[PDB]
Design a binder for this molecule. Structure first.
Ligand code: DX9
Ligand code: CA
Length: 223
């Protein structure tokens, strides 16, 4: 997260860290046995880390649970990043408490103007590389479809939305991938892609979760 602030230990209880020997992507806990992340975060041998703040120090509220199954969206296109969403089932259910909690799926799509909370352990520099050990947060508004499409000609689908600031300076970045975009208590986006990080006229692009609610519900009910 570039231009954000330190969230504070367990203030974003649904935030997960996907670990394969090291943190490589974020994710959101949607219930006690399921995690939602970006399809581009797909890997085998994933361990889901819940209740995390500092990812390099055992602080006491963590739950490390291995994934039993991963399901990439049937129409995911790795070249365009269309349908960049994936579900991960935990081998055992997480113990939900005040520090580890699920986030609600949306009942309707969010519109431009809505302020959301984006979080992750990704790169904090627009030019250069610096990865934080503790969770970073950023409040950012959802941008109009017109602005989004003007920024990325022919690359924005109905399954994507832009959020951030056209003036640059604040944005999610590499390492934040798969992480949550929560607006008014509902999971509306998943950190997907962008041209650089926090660059002028190059806002972050996120997966539009509201278009996948039925797929998510059906998949969980049958797996
Ligand atoms: C070629 C083209 N026009 N495309 C449009 C869709 C797709 O975009 C991508 C895919 C992977 C990357 C990563 C880099 C990359 C990876 C994750 C990111 C997460 C967030 C942000 C952000 N600024 N909010 C930027 C990221 C940039 C790479 O270079 O490998 C960057 C952009 C391909
Ligand atoms: Ca820790």
């Amino acid at each position: 997260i570039v231009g954000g602030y330190t969230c504070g230990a367990n203030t974003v209880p649904y935030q997960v860290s996907l670990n394969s020997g090291y943190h490589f992507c974020g994710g959101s806990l949607i219930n006690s046995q399921w995690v939602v992340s970006a399809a581009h975060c797909y890997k085998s041998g994933i361990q889901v880390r819940l209740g995390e703040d500092n990812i390099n120090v055992v602080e006491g509220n963590e739950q490390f649970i291995s994934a039993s199954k991963s399901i990439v969206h049937p129409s995911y296109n790795s070249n365009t990043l269309n349908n960049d969403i994936m579900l991960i089932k935990l081998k055992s259910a997480a113990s939900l408490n005040s520090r580890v909690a699920s986030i609600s799926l949306p009942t309707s799509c969010a519109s431009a103007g809505t302020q959301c909370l984006i979080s992750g352990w990704g790169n904090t520099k627009s030019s250069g590389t610096s990865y934080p050990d503790v969770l970073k947060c950023l409040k950012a508004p959802i941008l109009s479809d017109s602005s989004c499409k003007s920024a990325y000609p022919g690359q924005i689908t109905s399954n994507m939305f832009c959020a951030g600031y056209l003036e640059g300076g604040k944005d999610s970045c590499q390492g934040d991938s798969g992480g949550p975009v929560v607006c008014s208590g509902k999971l509306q986006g998943i950190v997907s892609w962008g041209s650089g990080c926090a660059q002028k006229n190059k806002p972050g692009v996120y997966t539009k979760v509201c278009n996948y609610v039925s797929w998510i519900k059906q998949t969980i009910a049958s797996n």
